[model samples]
Target chain A: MQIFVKTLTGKTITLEVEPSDTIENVKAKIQDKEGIPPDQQRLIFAGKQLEDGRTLSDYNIQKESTLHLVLRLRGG
Target chain B: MQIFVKTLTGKTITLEVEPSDTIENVKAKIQDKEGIPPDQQRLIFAGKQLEDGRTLSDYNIQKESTLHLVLRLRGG
Candidate 1:
């Protein structure tokens, strides 16, 4: 499925992914594309944080779904 | 002076205000523009959380300073 991800700068990107892809994998790709470290990335969908161990389908993320990316505070 | 604010969704907005502007007032403006309520808004600058009681100048926020906004988790 294709998903749309938006960043804090109002930049949106479309990614082609599989339903079986884990959220962690998605974060990895985001890190490569957006320069935000995977560990620092917090993915939110439907007002909830997506678990790293879960698959996209597990969160019911479908085509054209919008995912929000927020940066985690570093060093507390 | 003008300050730049970035949201989790990557939308950036510039606000024109005085250096004496309070963080709470900035959050109020962000609330109006981004639809995130003041209480739920967490403003971060230079990797530090901006306290609502402090003035922008109190934190050494100057022209073109960037602030990042994160949403506080609710009901959890």
Candidate 2:
């Protein structure tokens, strides 16, 4: 599936992830591809933190589902 | 040192701390004080992540210094 990953530097990156991938893998992949670190990452949906370790099966994520990688979790 | 914490919601917070505290410690403190989570915190000083495990002596952060917690780490 395609996911939009936004960086702290104000850069927005798009990535394709597999359904078998865990949230951890998605994070590592986004970080690796965009130079973002795992600790500095957040997966937000509708203003709330997505469940950690969530899988496609858990959330019924479709191949084209849009997920926002929020930079909102980094601050106070 | 006093740090300015910026939340994902764009709120800038100010916190007081000791020189012996590490970024990790500061993170936990801010989370405790402001109800932020460790996994969702950013301690941006001069727009860079301070070295983890860093002490105030290493960076010369004074009691009244300001730190900004960036909240844009979560989205695309």
What value does the lDDT take at residue B27 in candidate 1? 93
Put down candidate 2 lDDT per residue, A4-56, tens digits, no spaces.
Answer: 65554334677778877777787888778866666766776545566568875
Give each model's whole-structure lDDT: 0.84, 0.66
Tens digits of per-residue lDDT, candidate 1, A18-76, equal: 99999999998887778887877889998988979999999999888999887666674
* lDDT accuracy of residue B25 in candidate 2: 85
Model 2's DockQ score = 0.04
CAPRI grade of model 1? incorrect
Residue-by-residue lDDT tens digits, candidate 1, B1-76: 8889987555578888788989999999888787878988889998999988998989999789999887665575
**Highest-DockQ candidate:** 1
Q: Candidates' DockQ values? A: 0.19, 0.04
- Which residue ranges in model 1 land beyond 4 Å of their true spot? A74-76, B1-76
Query: Interface RMSD (Å) of model 2?
Result: 6.3
- Tell me the deviation in Å of residue A10 in model 1: 1.3
